[model samples]
Target: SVKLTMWIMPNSDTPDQDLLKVVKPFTDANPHITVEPTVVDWSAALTKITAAATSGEAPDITQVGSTWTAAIGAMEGALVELTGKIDTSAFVESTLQSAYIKGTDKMFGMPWFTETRALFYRKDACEKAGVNPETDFATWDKFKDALKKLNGIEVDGKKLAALGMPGKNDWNVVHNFSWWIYGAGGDFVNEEGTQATFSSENALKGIKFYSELAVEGLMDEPSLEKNTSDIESAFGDGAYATAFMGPWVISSYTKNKEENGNDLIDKIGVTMVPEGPAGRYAFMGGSNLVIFNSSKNKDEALELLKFFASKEAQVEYSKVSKMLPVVKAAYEDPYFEDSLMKVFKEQVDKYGKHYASVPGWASAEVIFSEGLSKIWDNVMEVDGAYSYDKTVQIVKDVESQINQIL
Candidate 1:
């Protein structure tokens, strides 16, 4: 008999019970294995897991954010490589990018659940502005026109901003800007992962367009000062007509409307990330399950990972977590056939992209976000006018700081 300990993030209000129920099939089949699960908050999970890995007191299995996979895997012999222990072909290809060690073929984590950003618009706003959310939001130029038309319109006696987005203080700062960066054909690091390349012309074009929106006040200016939760809640309250958000917004907004009696739920519309000059792209993010190197239950742990990769487990777990399953076959489940989910599913299948799977990326993200905040500050200081010279300088400076980490 083996007792296995696994640490997971709170995907649902009752994460412990949710996970236990999902794994019951495995536990029942393998009577010798007893799984004990622990739920940790996202903000504290990283530091705690890092300490455990360093001290060799880590749980047998842990659900790590995909972006953190490379950094955690870089810790010498801290994670069990999954090359031959489990099959990797079962996961969606984009989700697997973060599971590998930098510049190596060895995979250290199994893709558990996946998600990406999309455009959510309000039907009333679109109709009043004479903008077609379906057709007008297909490209950057048209999208900008649509936003300008939708901005500052009197709706229910309150003026509405075309969009609402969180700024530097939020956890998703880098991800928020990644759409424009990637859309302009710029990336955080060079292909070799040896140096930062986000200061390139392509990257500048993206940020330039992104900041110009804030400068023009096309997006809600005050909302930029808030975090993701606040922005989501405000959106639910019909504070903004459009937002860039993930799948979780559906559940959150649904619950918020039920409690507050808002009609925003009925007015919601979903669309893909608008295509930029280079192409369309959305930030692909989710968690990966990894086994610790120090775990005595290596085989049992491998069994658990393999089980997660199974289509049944993927659907079951993702259903409870309100996230998309990583397994491709899991989509056959009718739950993903919903129109809103299909938009996200199509985004991941076609235009999804992951950050550079390198050890420096996590640290670089912080430096990058701080630089973005400065650009926002500059825009506000100049009374909402973009300074190409100033923005370019800030981006170049950020590239240098990120290079140090790489």
Candidate 2:
């Protein structure tokens, strides 16, 4: 039998997490191709893929982060361009934007799943805090006040935070920070995608709002050490009354409802997040599957990518994983039809925003996040040592680094 291998990010695998279990249709259809699956630790992927990058020992096809699309495909030349291999028009425009590297006619990856983040809070707690969950967060000024009101509450003998945003990790901090930046109508790149814009007035407005939340004690100090999962866990434990996350989190929290059999699940709620002057926005996040240049099974690899992008494959997998299907029409599935998911569906459909799909974006994220990470270090001090002066300096340093990234 002919052999092929595909790599998947660690958590992107459907909860069952076994590609061998889901590939029955492909294997059955292509009896001659024996497909093997390889999974990688996301943080160490580049280091792990050294063999492929240098010696042509790569999987036939693999899934990559949208942020990596530009860097790996255009700068590093790790992936192949899929211009005529498959039809891309059916996917969302914003999702496709991430795969299409800026300054080039090449699209190196197929957008397999699209993700966007919004606000989730405990309804009962909002009511008790005197923050009207239904109306108070409708505007930026009101939302800011509501968050401060939501803070400093004790739930079940535990002091709860208004928002459970993690601050230790650069990537995590940057992701949440962008929600505000985009909400304030600012972007890291200029309209031409050629220069840094983090120091802009609108961008600083977003950063100032984010800073005020932490400085004002809206979120807890312990969250500084928390990552996304850790922050979500804090929410589950009642340490946080609200959170911001993508749809993947819904499945776990939903499952927790059944496991805990408590009011915690009943209190769970979702919202479009408060709109800023620019209106509501979401940080576009998701996985993209791509072909490696070293692969020997080019035709079969393309065929497999076609099957993966197909509604049947995309819908079936997304149902189990709770990720949004890249194919626009896949929402007809009964699972997505549920009202709980419709909000996210609409957001990704209409309001999703992506970072610049440039080769430098990967490094830009690092430089930017590094600045955010240092800012978080100041936030955790409990001494109120953080200053607007420090914030301005950090912002300036970040812009300077971004200016030099290319």
Candidate 3:
């Protein structure tokens, strides 16, 4: 029997279960194939996958986070470009655009599942704060004013926090902070992709705006103290009024409502994230399935990839997992048009934007986050964060050290 090993994310709810269900049917139909499935937690999956690839023991197929696609793809022929193997015309252009390295037009991954960031709010809380939750706040100034109005309202005999901001940890701050930077017409890198541009005037203004929320006391300390999960839990428990979250939170909140038998479902609502003078944008967060180049059976691995791209598999996988389907035909399903998932579909279909195609994206993300954290901690001023003069000197110093090593 042919052996196919698959690496999947561990903690997902419906997707994890649905993946197994889909794979079982595949295994049973093709009796000659025996699938070896391994589940790894998100935090450790990247490190483990990298180590396995380096040792020439990587799986036949693996689910890769979109953020790491470029870095992993550039690792000395680690991935097989699926351009000719899969029909790229059927997938969304934006989704397919993410898998390619900019300028060179080299494709590396197949978009499997997708997620987008949007605004989630409490209607009741908005009424109490005397702000129209439905109104559009297209600028940073307006968004901040709304937060000020919602800061401390009495709910269930307790003062609820205004907004949920995750700044205590580096990763949390790094990812979400991108929204503001992109909104304010700033970016972490230049077009050439050779150096960091986090110290630009536009970037500095965006970072300053991001830090002001905490500095002005619009965000609750308790919310900052919590991690991503804790912050989500606080939102569900009605400790906070507004947040920026993914569509998966809707299902999670729905499940919570069912478990508690409360009317929380009715109280929740979704809206597009407000735009800024530059534009409205968010990081397109999701995973893509890739076949490791080091695998023993390349043909069989490619076949498995083709199976995932099939119409039948995409429909079944999307239905069970409740994730935004990458296949266009899957969107025509009647269930997707219903009111419940309509907002999510709109965001996925409309405002979703992914990170720029840069090989050093991972390193750049870390550098940007570290700089932002220092700014938040009052260790660095906004102007110094991304100053061209400061970055030029630092780059020169690093280049000299690297030349010495060579």
Candidate 4:
């Protein structure tokens, strides 16, 4: 008998237990193999994973973030390349590219699950503002106009803001800003990935537009101090008119209702992200399963990876974790046939986008996050105000720092 250890990021309230629930059946069939699952928080996951990978003490299986895939895969002798080992065609096209080492066919990770953001709006809030969410929120100009109408409107005796999104303190700072920048035909890096371009005109325009919302008071000011979960919770509690959120919110609200009897599920509506200058794009991010080079149970781990990649397991795990599965077949499942899931599925299939697969992206992310966070701080400050000149300077400085890393 062999024991295999796995590390997974927190997906649900019971991340470890949720994983165990999925793997139990696999282990039940493979009676000789035993698996121990550990749940790691996303904040410390990269640092811990790097340490384990470099120190020759990694788990048999580790869940890698989609953005960090290239960087980790580049480390010498760190990951077991899986290009031909797994059924590569079983995964979604975009996500598969993310799991690879840049332009080559050297795949390093298996796409486990995926998620994308969309506009989650309150029906009553839109109704109160006399704005048709689907139509008014379909384009950038109309979206802003609708936000203005929705801002400060009283809904259910509670004053509601047009949007609820997190700022500097959140890990999703880059993810939140990507769509805006991409929508404006701006990208974080150039085609060769040798230069940072967030300081470019288009990118700066997106940054200015998004940050100015806070300056103009169209967004909840206090929510700037909050994180993603808190902002989502506020939206679920009917505190905001709308938010850019993912599929997890639906399951999150449903679980809250089932456990605590707090039900506000019916008021929410999910739609595609409003079209920007470039197009309607959303962040496509999720976890990938990677096998460490130091693992002794390599063959067993491969088998486990295959098990996870199965359509049945993909659908089952997504049902438990509320993340969209990477397997193409999983979309055909009756579970995803729900209207809300269809919107998410469409977003992932059509409008989803990801950061460049650069090996230095991990280090660059820190630089980018701090730079963006500082801009948010300045824009959200009650005493200070948003300054286009100052913001552009900061973005230029961030670009220089990222260039050094790249």
Candidate 5:
């Protein structure tokens, strides 16, 4: 019997126990292979996985988040590139793009489960606030108006939190903010991945629009407060009019609030990310599978990967995890037919975009986040008189940092 080890995501949004239950079939069918699953916490994933990579003692296979796909895969000799080994014609384009290294055809990660951010809203609350969730605010200008309108809404008795916007210098802000960037016809890098262009005209417009939302009080609650499950619970309890979040939050809201008269599912709805000057865009998330360079069982690991990619396994995971799958055939299952899930499915199919898939992109993320932090503080303290100049400076400063590393 051949032995293998797989490091799976710690199942923050979905439970790994449910996933573990589904794996027995694979074990039973492939009795000659025994796979060991280690649920690595997301926070500790990079730290430990990087250490394992350095030590040549890494697991045979690991589940890598889309955000880390480029960073980890681009590392020198750390992973096996699955270029022509898998059938990817049926996968969603942008989601599969996450696994493809920019400027090259090499694929270091295999796109598995995929997710995209969506506008999670309360139709009743938005309608009461004079904002239409359906057609009125299809454009970015109108969307901000609706967001600002939400600043004054009160439910039951107390004032609700303005959209659950995050302000801290981190992935939270950029994940949704990129929609603004791409909506304005801007991207973090050029097509060749050889340079940074977030300082360009349309890019600045997007950043300005992103900061303007904060300046207008859309983020009345500090980002740290919104970082946890607090936003999900708050949204469930009628404390928020809308939030930009991943599929997991919607899953939790419906599951947690579905039992009673106060059910949130009936009140809430989902839609495509609101459009901007350019058009609608979304920040994608989800895990991909990568085989470590040190694994002695690469051939067997490939077999295990094939099984996970099968429609049967993908459907089972979607049923249990609520996290959508990248395999095109998996969408045929009835589980994706829910009204809100349709919104997510649409976002995944159409408007999804990702961070620059290059090795230096990580440093660019840090710099991009620093720029967001400056925007947050500058606006909060000075009413944004110099926000534009500050944005110009952050872009230049970030590009300078990128130049040094590249």
Candidate 6:
């Protein structure tokens, strides 16, 4: 029997159980192949993958987040170029673009599933505050004002926060901040991927606007300690009226709807993230499935990848995991016609935006996250926080650091 091993992120809701279940039939049909799956914590998964590559004992296949494509792809001859492994013409153009290294023609991974975030709000709370919840807020300013109005109301005897702002964690804050930056026509890197453009006036203005929401008391203070999951839980419990979240929350929201019946679910609504000065924008947040270059059997690993990308596997996987499938064919499945997924599909089609395919985007995200957190906590004044000069220097330094690796 041929041995096939796959590495998956330990705590991920979708890939952990759903992906395994979908692959079961494949494994069963081919009795000659014995598939071995290994689950590893997110913190050590990348480290483990790198170690395996160096030790010449990497797994045959693995799931990797899109953000790591650049760093991992940069490893000297460490990735297998998927030039003709699968039919690229069958996938979404943007989704396929995300998997490729910027400024190069090589594709290092295949996208398994895709995700996008939208603003989920309490319709009842908006009505109580005399705000038109259905109307699109033309700018971030209007959205912040509406949030402040919602915060003044009481929900179930507890004060309701207008929004949840988690600044302690770098990833969430930086990502949230990026929405505004991108919306304002500011980019983190230049086309050549050799310089940082984050310190531009447009970028700084976007960051300042994002931090001001917290300073203006439109967001809950306790949110500083909350992660993405915590914020989602709070929103479900009605502790907050609105927050930015992705489609993956459908499963959780569905469970709450079942528990609370139609009353609570009816009050929950999803909408496109509010537009900013430049227009509407959102970060692309999702994971991708990849094959490790150090695998002993490249041909066997490619077969596994082909199976995962098939429409049949995608439909079954997405249904079980509550994640939107990357394949266009899977979107038309009857399963997505459900109310929760319907809303998610609408938002994704209308306002989804992916992270930049820059070489050192992963490191730049850390810098941006820390900078925005400090600004949100009042450690920096608006003028200082929005200083384009300082941001330019930081971006320049980061670009230089990342380019050296290439």
Best by lDDT: 4
Candidates, ranked, TM-score? 4, 1, 2, 5, 6, 3
Task: Pick the winner on TM-score between candidates 1 and 5.
Answer: 1
lDDT of 2 by residue, 214-297 (tens): 778887777876677788767766777777877777667667777786446567777776788788887888889888888877
TM-score, model 1 to reference: 0.94
Better of 3 and 5 by lDDT: 5
Model 6: residues >4 Å from true position, as ranges?
10-15, 136-138, 256-266, 379-406
lDDT of 3 at 14: 51
Distance (Å) between predicted and true CA of 15, model 5? 3.8
Regions more than 4 Å wrong, model 1: 382-386
Tens-digit lDDT track of model 6 for 1-406? 7899888763245455665688888888878776777887654666676676567777888777677676666677677778778787778666776688888887888888777777888888888888786773546767877887897687657778888756656366667766788887786666676766666788877766665666567777668665677787777777788888776666666677787763555677777777877777777766677777777788878888888888888888777666677888877778878876776666566666776665567656656566556555452343454453554455456545545543
In candidate 3, position 173 carries an lDDT of: 58
Q: Candidate 4's residue-wise lDDT over 1-406, tens digit each?
A: 9999999998876888888888888999999999898888888988998998899877999999988988999999999999889988877878887898776778899999988888999898889889997699998889999999999989877889899998765469889999999898899988877789888889998998888988888988888877898898888888889899878888789987888887678788899888999988888898899999999999999999999999889988888778989888887888887888889889878988888887999888777778888887778764476677888888989998888888
lDDT of each: 0.86, 0.77, 0.69, 0.87, 0.75, 0.71
Clashing pairs in 4: none
TM-score of each: 0.94, 0.93, 0.86, 0.98, 0.90, 0.88
Candidate 5 structure quality by residue, lDDT tens digits, 61-160 = 9998787788888888889989888778877666777787777787999987877778778777787788878875577777777888888587667777
Using TM-score as the measure, the top candidate is 4
Please give the ranking of all candidate structures by lDDT, highest first, separated by commas: 4, 1, 2, 5, 6, 3
Q: Between candidates 1 and 4, which one is better according to TM-score?
A: 4
Candidate 1, residue 375: the lDDT equals: 80
lDDT by residue (1-406, candidate 1, tens digit) is 8999999987865889989999999999999999999998876777888888889978999999899889888889889988877776776777889899778988888889988989999898899889888799999999999999999877778888999988756458888889899999898787888898888889988988987897888987787777787898789888888999888877777776688776677889899999998989888899999999999999999999888889999889877666889888998898777888899889977988888889877677678768888887776663555577888989889888888888
Q: Which 10 residues in a row give candidate 6 its minimum summed lDDT? A: 379-388
Model 2: residue 194 alpha-carbon error in angstroms:
1.6
Residue 279 error, candidate 3, Å: 2.2
